[PDB]
């Protein structure tokens, strides 16, 4: 094949042009996103039961939903969260790889069969299914800087004149609103209701009757009488469209003209649907929008379009409004693209410089510069054809594979140049001989790299996708590079080389070149005689090999393991949990204190604090609170003392003094879609039907037991809310009936006075909005106030609510959790800074084994993924080992020679482990990928050396020692050149300061250690293995 | 370290 294309340079040029065109077309159209679909598909069902405690929502709503959601295939695990506010959330997480667009239909259809089995209020509110594993492209906050608009006004303005336009641009998927639009609130007044002899049911009936739409029909009906010529539409009563119209609703009119109006008994205003969440941006009331990227869309273009559309609206922005972007993900993608371009340019310049330094010929230097971009475009085209995207992992694989492309180019060019120098033949025949000698080795190493990288893509779960991106990119790059080396490069060696005379290797000239050649030749002679001397003996270095092996094993065992390193994303969360029974006022005070601290003592680091009151990751309620703190750009935060870790450590140290609140601060995981906390999630599940008190006592005992080992477990905290006092009202049914009061009236009054009822819909400024009915604050705020409400009996008299009702106190849980259909509770927390996660998991399992009988344990979230390393058992590494053994035995006919090649594998793993231990990084996915790359490079060097030695031994009559020494003398310049190129090209990865530098640091350190140690300890060791294998198996 | 608490003083008064 290579000699075939040598005589036809333009055939190779045509193939290159086709590949370049394919790469350009691929780069023209390709989705761009921060991360691929890494998290497993998840569907969340949300339902609302206004003014209902946790128990009512749990038994009457989510029980029926959970019962009727059985039979869904590919279901991994289900969780359920009820609340005292009245919201229930059921999250179903499926297996990885399934089509979510069908699972959503399945769960929705199964839910629609249980709709008539739910109470009426939840049906009127409505339930909604959605996909929670989508991640937020950006959040757009809108704030008021004068004090006119409130949260409700801002939310309605966004819902009316911002949501549609922002949703109707290009590339935008789901758009979520963090507020609620307007709603006509009707605040009763018990004094006025008693004055006119009315009850809330009368107001509800009047609103239902006087705020309806009637199908009037049509003038000149559908069957017309003979001789009709007029036809029109009749417009009868319609929905009320203003507060002044709602205030004129009649409630009681006598025959003499006396009337009672709704405004005479209640206050009508325009408010929100629920006053449960208060959002303040830097101390000002604010609302927000969440924009998610649609599938198969460009992130940067969508962001630019969103920014332009938002900047269009300022002339029409009313009053004082400001638009801010607390959190967006585009800078990471821009940084990734910039790093890719920088690495490509640096590699090209570096390889040109090193080729000029060594080969001294410009025509030799120019050959790879017109070959590496061809392979890059081919990789782009193949990756586009397969169905991948431009993530932050594929480009990392490309910057990793640049070294492989450079290695192939260096090998081919150096071999042809040395053949020409030592043979005297001109470029044509020298290229023919070199290609004929090296084609088998090239095919063998391509097959070896494919065999070592493909099985990594067969992992399951999130790790499966993370490995899949790198594996696909690497194998595509290797295949394209070897195809290019077979087709395009031999033509280049045929045409663009100068046939210089033998012996003119720069020794005829002085300066840097001749002198450098002098020490290079002297060092080559020294190395050759040294390796000959060491090869004279065999058993002296077997003990060194065993020492290296045992040291590598000890380092592998000692090195801690984790899942994925933390990164400085510029955003971190702060959580506030007040004691049980705390109201909104104290939470607002604590949030104000936190905001003041952040904006006063960290002015040079933070940029804005988006405080949210009433909602927390643990559980919604008037007891918790959250705050998303965003930092300035990484350019303005120099040093390691101004990163996320130091900032959050100082923040929690300072917040430890905040009384009446346990304020914590933490950093969100690098992949935001998978989980919300950086630590493991552990779940205790009741099985023997103990109840709730036993479960709580067991959880407290386990927490105390785990807190007694402050060496591997840190920040072990519950994820729920503790039990709270509750008010119990008991109505004397027979007393109420005796007095003449119907039970229905009492129940309706109690449910519409303190809980609030949703009655009808109305048209406001050209849109549909609900109307809500509830008492006016001061009459529903203390227990004694329950005596202020009056109910009409049959006789027409009004009886007070305190004449037939009592009251008492109780204890109840404000948040009930369920896992897989059983009551359960969750403990979430990280591990020690100096130990592996798996050891903490094992110790937590051992601690849970000591629990009282009847309580089981389980994992969820990333922990479950960490428990999916059963495929990471040697059952897969061994498969790869046998596959590469078979490939090596097939490349050259021997069942024993590949042992020498495999013996070089530990010599790079030892260096990778040394670098990891020196830097202190843990064993994670990126380090594993770098280790595999180093193993592949060492195997490539071993393949080249062994193949050259075997060819010299077989084709000619050279003896074992003589052929081995000649081969190792011959394969010295390419190895050193490739090692120098790789080591110098991976400098920025190790030296990277910030901007998502954790993965870069880990991979660069692993690559540096592996490459340096393999280059140092392979030239001296591979010949020993070769000669030992040949003599022992002679 | 030593935990600290904010406490109120109980004294009778007519209302």
């Amino acid at each position: 094949m290579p000699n075939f294309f040598i005589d036809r340079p333009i055939f190779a040029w045509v193939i290159a042009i086709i590949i370049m065109l394919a790469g350009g077309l691929a780069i023209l159209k390709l989705p761009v996103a921060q991360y691929p679909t890494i998290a497993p598909p998840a569907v969340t069902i949300s339902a609302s039961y206004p003014g209902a405690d946790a128990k009512t929502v749990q038994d009457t709503v989510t029980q029926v939903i959970e019962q009727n959601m059985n039979g869904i295939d590919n279901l991994m695990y289900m969780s359920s969260n009820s609340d005292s506010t009245g919201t229930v959330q059921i999250t179903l997480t499926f297996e990885s790889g399934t089509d979510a667009d069908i699972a959503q239909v399945q769960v929705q259809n199964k839910l629609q069969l249980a709709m008539p089995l739910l109470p009426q209020e939840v049906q009127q509110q409505g339930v909604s299914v959605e996909k929670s594993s989508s991640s937020f492209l950006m959040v757009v906050g809108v704030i008021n800087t004068d004090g006119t608009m409130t949260q409700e006004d801002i939310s309605d303005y966004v819902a009316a004149n911002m949501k549609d336009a922002i949703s109707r641009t290009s590339g935008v998927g789901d758009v979520q609103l963090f507020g609620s639009q307007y709603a006509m609130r009707i605040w009763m007044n018990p004094n006025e209701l008693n004055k006119f002899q009315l009850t809330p049911v009368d107001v509800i009936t009047a609103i239902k009757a006087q705020n309806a739409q009637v199908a009037a029909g049509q003038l000149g009906g559908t069957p017309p009488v003979k001789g009709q010529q007029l036809n029109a539409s009749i417009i009868a009563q319609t929905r009320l469209t203003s507060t002044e119209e709602f205030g004129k609703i009649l409630l009681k009119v006598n025959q003499d003209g006396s009337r009672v109006l709704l405004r005479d008994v209640a206050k009508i205003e325009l408010g929100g649907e629920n006053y449960d969440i208060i959002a303040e941006f830097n101390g000002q009331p604010a609302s927000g929008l969440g924009i998610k990227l649609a599938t198969g869309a460009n992130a940067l273009d969508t962001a630019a379009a969103i920014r332009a559309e938002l900047a269009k609206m300022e002339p029409f922005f009313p009053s004082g409004l400001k638009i801010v972007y607390p959190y967006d993900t585009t800078p990471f993608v821009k940084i990734s693209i910039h790093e890719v371009v920088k690495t490509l340019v640096e590699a090209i310049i570096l390889v040109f410089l090193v080729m000029y330094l060594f080969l001294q010929n410009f025509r030799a230097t120019l050959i790879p510069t017109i070959a590496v971009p061809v392979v890059l475009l081919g990789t782009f085209a193949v990756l586009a054809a397969f169905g991948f995207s431009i993530n932050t992992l594929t480009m990392f694989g490309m910057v990793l594979a640049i070294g492989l492309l450079v290695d192939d180019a260096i090998v081919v060019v150096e071999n042809v140049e040395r053949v020409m120098a030592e043979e005297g033949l001109p470029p044509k025949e020298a290229t023919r001989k070199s290609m004929g000698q090296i084609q088998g080795a090239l095919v063998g190493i391509a097959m070896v790299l494919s065999a070592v990288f493909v099985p990594m893509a067969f992992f399951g779960g999130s790790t499966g996708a993370i490995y899949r991106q790198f594996s696909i990119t690497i194998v595509s790059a290797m295949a394209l590079s070897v195809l290019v080396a077979l087709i395009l490069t031999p033509a280049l060696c045929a045409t663009m080389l100068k046939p210089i005379a033998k012996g003119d290797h720069g020794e005829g000239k002085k300066g840097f070149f001749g002198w450098f050649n002098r020490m290079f030749e002297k060092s080559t002679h020294h190395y050759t005689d040294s390796v000959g001397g060491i090869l004279r003996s065999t058993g002296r270095y077997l003990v060194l090999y065993l020492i290296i092996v045992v040291g590598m094993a000890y380092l592998f065992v000692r090195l801690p393991s984790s899942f994925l390193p933390d990164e400085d994303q510029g955003v971190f969360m702060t959580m506030v949990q007040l004691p049980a029974g705390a109201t909104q006022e104290r939470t607002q005070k604590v949030l104000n204190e936190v905001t003041h601290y952040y904006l006063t003592k960290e002015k040079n680091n933070v940029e804005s604090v988006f405080a949210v009151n009433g909602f927390g990751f643990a559980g919604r309620g008037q007891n918790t609170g959250i705050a998303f703190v965003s930092l300035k750009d990484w350019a303005d935060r120099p040093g390691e003392e101004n990163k996320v870790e130091a900032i959050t450590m100082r923040a929690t140290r300072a917040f430890s003094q905040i009384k009446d609140a346990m304020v914590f601060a933490f950093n969100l995981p690098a992949i935001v879609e998978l989980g919300t906390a950086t630590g493991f999630d552990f779940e205790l599940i009741d099985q023997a039907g103990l109840g709730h008190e036993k479960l709580t006592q067991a959880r407290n005992q386990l927490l105390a037991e785990a807190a007694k080992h402050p060496d591997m477990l840190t920040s072990v905290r519950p994820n729920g809310l503790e039990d709270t006092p509750q008010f119990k009202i008991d109505i004397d049914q027979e007393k109420a009936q005796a007095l003449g009061v119907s039970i229905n009236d009492i129940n309706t009054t109690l449910g519409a006075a303190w809980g609030g009822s949703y009655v009808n819909d109305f048209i406001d400024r050209g849109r549909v909005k609900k109307v809500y009915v509830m008492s006016e604050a001061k009459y529903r705020m203390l227990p004694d106030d329950i005596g202020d409400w009056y109910v009409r009996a049959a006789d027409g008299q009004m009886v007070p609510f305190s004449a037939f009702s009592s009251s008492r106190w109780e204890y109840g849980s404000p948040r009930l959790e369920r896992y897989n259909g059983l009551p359960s509770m969750e403990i979430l927390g990280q591990a020690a800074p100096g130990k592996s996660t798996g050891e903490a998991m094992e110790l937590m399992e051992q601690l849970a084994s000591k629990l009282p009988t009847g309580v089981g344990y389980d994992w969820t979230g990333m922990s479950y993924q960490e428990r999916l390393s059963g495929n990471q058992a040697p059952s897969l590494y061994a498969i790869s080992l046998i596959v590469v053994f078979l490939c090596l035995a097939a490349l050259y006919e021997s069942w024993s020679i590949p042992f020498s090649v495999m013996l070089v594998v530990p010599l790079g793993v030892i260096g990778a482990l040394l670098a990891a231990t020196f830097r202190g990084l843990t064993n994670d996915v990126y380090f594993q990928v770098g280790l595999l790359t180093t193993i592949g490079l060492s195997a490539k060097n071993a393949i080249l050396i062994v193949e050259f030695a075997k060819d010299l031994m077989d084709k000619e009559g050279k003896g074992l020692i003589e052929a081995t020494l000649d081969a190792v003398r011959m394969r010295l310049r390419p190895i050193l050149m490739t090692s120098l190129a790789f080591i110098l090209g991976v400098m920025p990865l190790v030296i990277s300061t910030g901007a998502g530098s954790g993965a870069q640091n880990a991979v660069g350190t692993g690559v540096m250690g592996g490459m340096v140690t393999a280059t140092v300890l392979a030239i001296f060791f591979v010949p020993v293995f070769f000669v030992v294998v040949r003599r022992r198996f002679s | 370290q030593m935990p600290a608490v904010g406490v109120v003083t109980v004294k009778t008064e007519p209302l």
């Binding site: 009446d660 | 935990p3 600290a4 904010g6 406490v7 003083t9």
Partner: protein, 31 residues
């Protein structure tokens, strides 16, 4: 409160979450 509390007693108002029975604490009056 009708019974249980006497004149001059001290009742914690803040720091309840971070405190536990039978622990020495620094008590300060708040306004």
């Amino acid at each position: 409160v009708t019974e249980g509390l006497k004149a001059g007693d001290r009742v914690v108002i803040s720091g309840l979450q971070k405190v536990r029975p039978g622990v020495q604490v620094k008590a300060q009056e708040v306004t």
